[PDB]
Amino acid sequence: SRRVEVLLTQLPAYNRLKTPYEEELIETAKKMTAPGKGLLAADESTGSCSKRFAGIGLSNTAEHRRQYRALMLECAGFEQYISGVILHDETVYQRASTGETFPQLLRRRGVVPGIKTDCGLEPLVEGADGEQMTAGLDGYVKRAKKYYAVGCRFCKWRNVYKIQNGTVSEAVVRFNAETLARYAVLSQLCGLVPIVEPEVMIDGTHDIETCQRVSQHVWAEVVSALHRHGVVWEGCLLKPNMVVPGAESGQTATAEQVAEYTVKTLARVLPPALPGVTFLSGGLSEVMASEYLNAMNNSPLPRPWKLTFSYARALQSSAIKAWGGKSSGVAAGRRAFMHRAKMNSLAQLGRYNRGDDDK
Amino acid sequence: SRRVEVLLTQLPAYNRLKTPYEEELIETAKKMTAPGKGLLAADESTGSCSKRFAGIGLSNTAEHRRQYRALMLECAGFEQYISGVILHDETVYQRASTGETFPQLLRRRGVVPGIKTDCGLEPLVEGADGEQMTAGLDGYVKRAKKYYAVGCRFCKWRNVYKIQNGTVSEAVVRFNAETLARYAVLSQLCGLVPIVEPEVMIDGTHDIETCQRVSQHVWAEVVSALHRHGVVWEGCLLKPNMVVPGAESGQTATAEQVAEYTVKTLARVLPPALPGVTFLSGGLSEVMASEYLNAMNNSPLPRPWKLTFSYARALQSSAIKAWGGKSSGVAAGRRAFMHRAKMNSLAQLGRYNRGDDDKD
Amino acid sequence: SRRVEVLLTQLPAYNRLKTPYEEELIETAKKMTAPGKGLLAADESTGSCSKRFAGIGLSNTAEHRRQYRALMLECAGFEQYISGVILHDETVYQRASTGETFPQLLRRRGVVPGIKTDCGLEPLVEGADGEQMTAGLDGYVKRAKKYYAVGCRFCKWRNVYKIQNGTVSEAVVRFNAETLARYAVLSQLCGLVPIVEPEVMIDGTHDIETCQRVSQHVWAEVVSALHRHGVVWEGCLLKPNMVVPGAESGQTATAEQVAEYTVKTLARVLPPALPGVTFLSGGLSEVMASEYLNAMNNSPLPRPWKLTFSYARALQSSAIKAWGGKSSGVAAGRRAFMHRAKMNSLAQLGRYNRGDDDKD
Amino acid sequence: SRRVEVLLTQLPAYNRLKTPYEEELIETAKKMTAPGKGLLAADESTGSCSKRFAGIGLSNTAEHRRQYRALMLECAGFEQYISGVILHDETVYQRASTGETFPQLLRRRGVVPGIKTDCGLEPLVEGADGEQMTAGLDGYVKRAKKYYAVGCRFCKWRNVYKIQNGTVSEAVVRFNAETLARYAVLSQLCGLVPIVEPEVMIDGTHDIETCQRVSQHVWAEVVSALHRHGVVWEGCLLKPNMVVPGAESGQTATAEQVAEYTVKTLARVLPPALPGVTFLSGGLSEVMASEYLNAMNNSPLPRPWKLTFSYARALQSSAIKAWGGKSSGVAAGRRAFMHRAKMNSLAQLGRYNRGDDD
Amino acid sequence: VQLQESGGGLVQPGGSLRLSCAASETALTYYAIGWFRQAPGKEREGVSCISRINSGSGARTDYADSVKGRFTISRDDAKNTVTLQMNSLEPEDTARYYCALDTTDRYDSANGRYYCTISSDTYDYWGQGTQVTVSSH
Amino acid sequence: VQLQESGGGLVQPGGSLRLSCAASETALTYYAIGWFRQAPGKEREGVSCISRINSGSGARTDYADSVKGRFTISRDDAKNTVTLQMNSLEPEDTARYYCALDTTDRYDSANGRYYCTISSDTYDYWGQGTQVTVSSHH
Amino acid sequence: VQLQESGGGLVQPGGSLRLSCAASETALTYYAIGWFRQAPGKEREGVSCISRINSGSGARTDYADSVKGRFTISRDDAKNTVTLQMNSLEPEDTARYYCALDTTDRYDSANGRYYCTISSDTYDYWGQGTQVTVSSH
Amino acid sequence: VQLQESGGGLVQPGGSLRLSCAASETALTYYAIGWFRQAPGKEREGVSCISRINSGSGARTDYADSVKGRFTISRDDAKNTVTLQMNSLEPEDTARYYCALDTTDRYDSANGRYYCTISSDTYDYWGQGTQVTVSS
């Protein structure tokens, strides 16, 4: 019948985000998930850079951080294997030796520049002790629009979940999902493809079965919140943990088991309209991050989204050590970096060969 | 900091259903979604048979209803195209010309027997006028375990959503989703693969964009409830409507448009671990149901689940009319049935050819 | 900026139930919570009656159950203390020695007749082992309209929650709340004032703090579900457990402690528009149910709703024992019943005197 | 059946906030809702002060804003009627002519000092056009602990809901409720009594029945969100709109109708453990805000919480006009302010008399 | 719980007394009330009952044959008392007189009326009684 | 849909032929297959049927009496064909020979086996036929 | 709102009076209170003020020079009154005497004390007064 | 990873050869490529570099002075090869010739073009070489 004339946007079925960047977001997500390519995660904080420079005894100055990023970004040829680079805010405004800003350099070489837009972990207050939320939604629209103006086309936001006593609190599952979903739609409104990172951390004594069950519970709520907030699924990406046994569990898992636990979990919760999954390496070794990603791209289970990488330490660890922070080590660093990029490129294609890798 | 030892099943992340039939459910769902095959929906109520027999002047007796199902179930060769048959409760216990019960006949020929387990539509009371819930969860476990005992291995439950004024009430979105999910987990506990049917009905003046948005909103809530109730995703099937313009909207859509609106909606909500989608024909003609299903299997959009059919009228309309309720029409009826079955089998594979089909 | 004209009932803020009995439900709820009066819960199942008849050696026939209810319903004078009687379905149609049916008898004496409309506890399947749902929503509207037609004006539906290992599963919290809310709204549509009974059971080793925290969690979800389904708050009643230590906990609590834990829990979740709270006696002794209710009606905490009783064992235990199932014991049985009725009537007013009660 | 030992705080039924200020929060909320007293809302923004000073021709400087608050805060005797004062961030650190900071002055006179801690309205992005969220949760814990350190003991956070076409979007109902609940639990962690203000705005052509239905829907979701986040109900306050016809509806309602629509809505959603309701005046005149509150405290409907005021314009409008920004008008301004305070004090007790008023 | 009888005493034959029945914590309007008497060495016999008040025809009464015409029973629900006016007392009327409540719901649905009985099977809450002695000596 | 018959021709009496029955897009393994023949000016008569393959005991066969001992019917489900080996042909065997599918589910649950019938009532999808002429004087 | 003064009258020189200041619906404990006077043909001059009670130390007072030593002001917050004891009255003390409240928060935080002023600038709610005439005649 | 050089051999003075540089698992289009040579008992000298292809002005080239005018370097990104055409060879041109990849992003943002260097400081992935002997 008929009683009141309302806006379509006031009705629950019409909650989808209206953004003028929709077609551009979809194209960026396709570019970012190109076959045989993945993301380089170079978005470490200045503090986190002190832990990377510790082993090589390099002072944590803004210039040494620039040379650290320059070791990889001004390396020729990595566009064969890297589709996008997650930049830290500081690096977005720094310049390469070519005279361009790093966003300009990356777009000249067909690489999508992205920016980490979250403002770090804080205590959750609700839930259990040790659980953390992520700050940064205040003033987000102004920040994201400014990153877009200087050339960025995607962003990354990280929430963490601490498995304790085989479980996580329902407070952190509800709250962090709502944070990720709100972040996603604000990014798409400003023209950045949001990378939604709900990381079930590896720390703890839990086995791979506890991780599987917590990960599915956590990611399912993330997906539910994304529906509620009206995300554009085709212009969105997920950066999840791999389902692996806890770091201090004493248990071990083969690459095929990790692949089966991970892909079957994703297949239960992740809508196939989502273009790509860019796994974080977390607490895996360089070889293990290539080994596991390869196993997932040989899985018989359903996997309609692209399974690729968004690696930080798993792409730079050997490179930083060979670099030594010295200009004489640049050649060795880029040799190490490019080898890791090539291995993970093959792992995305399912043709990674462990014998062609480190021993 | 106080601690307590609890059961894992008391923790929210451990809500997955524990059923001893899990491996059998997964195998049945694979069998039902075999390439080039779909389901025959023969689960009409005694009332619904009254409208099927109206045109041919056949009396609505239990025996003529038996011959109605026998016209198709004792037709040779349909195992080429039909992976499973949704049976009515009455037909489960009726006997074929071979001497077997119809579930026994279907299991001899490699076809999975299924049963409609819902108890019909009722007024929702909440929400808007004209919206309906589905009854039947009281005593469900007792019924399902008995259907399993006589050979059934999957079931079907139908909820409807009536688009009025471009929307549906939030009461019907929440309640019907909660009903379907509860039905799904009770079925899997009893060893039946649940066919979850959330049908956004064709009636009304809404356009295809209204159907897309209501369908996505409705199906997303169904999926969310399935998560809450702990369904075994790999042993479950979805029977949705296709996204099409309203029956009295005055708008029309091509097969390529219907496929894009439907697949893009499913891809936004439906987990890939779900083995198959068995579309209902609803208010489409026989040729149109094959044409739309074929277009779906030629879509460039993501579709990790099997896209197949669970057709009733779209498989039997010509068969009933050529049959005429007379034994002399059996040969023509089975010729019509088998043609519709082969056409939809090719449509599932993406190889349906409209020129090899009817012209009217 | 596109617009559509919709029904108000399709908008989430307009989900309140439209029932033609709204004015009568509100008046009935006021009558049921009249000062100094409470409810007699005489709705035990045929199974439960064998456990009541065990000690007195009375055979569990429909006629002996009739005499059991007649011992109290044909007792003169209980209208001073009893505002309503929860009847079992069997008793609604049985006849008193006055020649009228028991609903007619209660209606002649100004007592509101009510009916238990749930169909008993079943395994929840979801959640943890030992948790239970309540059946009976299929065909509910038909049943309730018949109870109203024969004189019933309120109803009762019981869900239970089993504290295990200091907690309950989230599945039972959502599902049982959703069941109670749907039951409540269907009752008000048919003209019965719903008594919503979410009983956190006394069984187990948990302390009064575990009961407090589980009860608040459970009752908050019941209230949320009632909002979602659109209950008429002013024509609704709650029948909760009191917050007490577990039966096998080894801990004890005073009446004033039980009063503080119970009222402070209710004050956190229960809207003041709800007219009344009719406590269940559960696993308390006869005297404990009277003193605890008395302590709550002397509480300094906020309690805008009427706090009264809906007792079964706490009103009949001594009555059955003095009766013995023999016609010679009727006088002694009615003396025990009427004493308990007067004690709880005074407890409702807060003027219960422990020295006027039984010895220990 | 496998078993695991977990923390109680990991179980959903144990989600209540653990704060060391719990006993103090409850005591503050009792103090703020003392019989016959209400709150003075003096938390206008620098922008909002430009609209107040427009009529009197006073320049909008930090010093004239200080004198604006001083006209009321250094007026003797208002502690008879005012239990607490909501301060703006600027005023928290400004000093009175007595030499104290305004929080110190208020604590010397037994008045609870409070602070508006939200960071203003922003576009909701989701939902319908014109709907707004409230910013300010980033760094909230650091701000609240600093406000507590300088003497504040409660805070205020305002969310708004715009009735358009007889309804509001479900996005704004869910999102704004979640913001208020998160704000409330963070405040109690830092020792501030949260005043939860979910204002269903008066703008629009909607009738009082539309306002009733949207208000109940909005407030019920706020209450549900407060449950989810584990608020301490006994140390919390609500600052809702009154249920009234739309400003441009052409409809009118009597004080007795407004009281019935408002109390019956609150009674359907608001737990009685919540100590007090401090109504916002919004678009009501000075006399109408006193008349409506009086009707609210003479209602037969259930109202277990204290029904009082948290008025801004309804307490200062006549005072500012008589003040004129000139030192010669201070005596006349304070006479008007104290009269409004006495009227609303009587309205809280239910003894407001319209004939003793303007 | 117990009722309180009063009004008895010692009278000469042909005289009269007025017995009164009072209740503290019970509303008598909900009961049929009966007067009984017991002489030393005899069983307890019913003297008079009065039903609850029927809104159209008032309350019903009944009497033992030995007292008809001489005794009159009445009830005042407002004052919460039941009275037995005993006239023309013979010495065969000497006994202890008791008040009691009928604990059975005495309704007759065939005739739509409350009634009472002179029996005592369903009576309870007997008082302590009051002695009535009719004698010439 | 239609079957394809082949193998017919002209032979002298006492000779032999082999008729073949083929199907394009249908799997014959699901049907009982029958060979029929019609002589000019006569009705269509059943010659031989073959049931579906019974696991372990093979397919069941039947023949018209006038043909027993001379014709042999077989089926190859892998090659999707049915064969009729006709031996010792008489001049009374001249006719057009047809292939057809039994559209009835020919199962005998009492004996637990698939069967066949030479009756043409439930046969369908007849082909165009193949001519078999047995004559010496041609 | 306005205060109620009392206690004035006619006395001979050297005599004494006690003026009282009362309030109906106002708590004087929240104000500094001042006594003022107006003489025939002259303007209103301050006579005595008293501050609010300073916790543990009592109230601070001040007086006009012409009355120092003879007048004493006190306050009773419980009885809600302000008293002015006028002793040894001279003829220049004849006037109408008024009570008033200081509407300014008279606190001095450097000095940690409530204070008062006899200046009438910030006083309000003047009563009707009470006449005091000191004369022989 | 390593490049594969070919085309060298024995020629008489004034003759010519054509050296080819091929890549297995690397896309040469992303690098500036340089040809180098080493004679027995001396250091490795740069012969010719070629930048990446600049749309649409082609790649920039550079040559050692001792070789300018006689050698020509080219690249075919489709066939993934770099060619060095050596003409009119003198006997002082005898050496083993290597191709290598410049691992530095050789971009000139002031002129908006890719460039190259014969320096060899930033070159890597040297092949095994190909011997070129010019002698009578």
Numbering used by the authors:
A (entry chain D): 2 to 360
B (entry chain C), C (entry chain A): 2 to 361
D (entry chain B): 2 to 359
E (entry chain E), G (entry chain F): 2 to 138
F (entry chain G): 2 to 139
H (entry chain H): 2 to 137
Please give the exact wording used by the authors of the publication that reports this structure.
Recently, we identified a Nanobody (Nb474) that was employed to develop a homologous sandwich ELISA targeting T. congolense fructose-1,6-bisphosphate aldolase (TcoALD). Fructose-1,6-bisphosphate aldolase is an enzyme involved in the glycolytic pathway and most members of this protein family occur in solution as tetramers. In trypanosomatids, most glycolytic enzymes (including aldolase) are located in specialized organelles called glycosomes. As such, TcoALD is part of the T. congolense “secretome”, i.e. the collection of all molecules secreted/excreted by the parasite, which is probably why it can act as a biomarker for active T. congolense infections.
At an estimated molecular mass of ~230 kDa for the peak at a 4:4 molar ratio, this complex likely corresponds to a hetero-octameric (Nb474-TcoALD)4 complex in which four Nb474 occupy identical sites on the TcoALD tetramer (TcoALD4). The crystal structure of the (Nb474-TcoALD)4 complex confirms that TcoALD4 indeed contains 4 binding sites for Nb474. Nb474 binds an epitope on the TcoALD surface that is located relatively far away from the aldolase A and B dimer interfaces. The Nb474 epitope is located on the extremities of the TcoALD tetramer, thereby easily allowing all four copies of Nb474 to bind their epitopes without mutual interference. The Nb474-TcoALD interaction is mediated by residues from all three complementarity determining regions (CDRs). The bulk of the contacts are provided by CDR1 and CDR3, while a single amino acid from CDR2 (Arg53) is involved in TcoALD recognition. As shown by analytical SEC, the titration of Nb474 against TcoALD shifts the equilibrium towards the formation of an aldolase tetramer. Nb474 contains a cavity, which is perfectly aligned with the position of Ala77 on the TcoALD epitope. Hence, given a local rearrangement, a Glu side chain could be easily accommodated. The presence of a Tyr residue at this position would disrupt the salt bridge between Asp106 of Nb474 and TcoALD Arg109 and Arg110.
